[PDB]
Amino acid sequence: GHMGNAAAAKKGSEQESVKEFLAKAKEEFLKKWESPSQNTAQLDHFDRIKTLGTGSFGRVMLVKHKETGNHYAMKILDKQKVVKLKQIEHTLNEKRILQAVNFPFLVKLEFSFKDNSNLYMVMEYVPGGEMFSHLRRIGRFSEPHARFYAAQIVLTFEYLHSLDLIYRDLKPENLLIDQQGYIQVTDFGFAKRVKGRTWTLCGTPEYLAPEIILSKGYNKAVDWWALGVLIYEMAAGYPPFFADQPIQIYEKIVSGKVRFPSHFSSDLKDLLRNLLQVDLTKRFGNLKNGVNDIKNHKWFATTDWIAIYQRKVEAPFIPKFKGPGDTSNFDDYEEEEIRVSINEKCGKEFTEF
């Protein structure tokens, strides 16, 4: 066979240990899921420093906790901007999931609260910047470099999916680089606890699985498709379904055709053909052997999965950091003062937040 005696036994034992870890992780998750936290701070506890990023509903700002001096990333959502039904439900998903999970590559939520106008989620500040800007600056990552980041996403999805959580917005914009060069996944605005299928049409066009575009009830395998898109974009410098307008992107996704740069290794192309698989009976991550079809693929043969989890692999890139609060690894954004109305807005819609 492909493995000899010692290799096969080591792999089997490793896979059983994963099962044991995930069973304990589920117990811990459910305790926090059953009894969440809320109202653990207020706005005047923080000095607002700089906008780190923007989105449809608000912004993420670097803030400084006045009492401790610790820096954090504060996501501010304008309750009135969270207009549509699925926008509301998604925001409650995001807070509840973030407060309950615990994994080395998932950003940590420290405080949550709301006021008359906004919702606030105060998270760990990750000073190395977005993968997105490093990737666009260098062009493309080498295959070993891409593989180091991909391995962290594989483990993170193995963790989330074991909890019946789907992530649904993988892309380089949502992946922050920490001081050790490892990944922190942020933006759980599209994460959801799903036991089987779900039906919301949501995500980012380039990263959408065909079953989402086709208005089919879909499952966690959409995250494995998105991993294929991410690995392709990291290694090529552009994603596999690439067009100026979303409708054109959607047409390419559903076609079942992908072309690869001539510099892609054959191992990489084989992995990507099995992730970017329109037939769900054939897509890696969705088969009888689950995540192990990915973890045991030839392209990951050099990956020490436990060492990645323990953060003991030398990162390909260590961000430059000049001290706490340094924002040199982030792009600049237009600053807009934070206004809090005298009247409570959308109080009933966000009771649970």
């Binding site: 699925k86 926008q87 914009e173 949501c202 995500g203 066009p205």
Partner: peptide, 13 residues
Amino acid sequence: AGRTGRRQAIHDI
């Protein structure tokens, strides 16, 4: 040709 800047997620459609 395609989108090179940051990409916004869509909540519907």
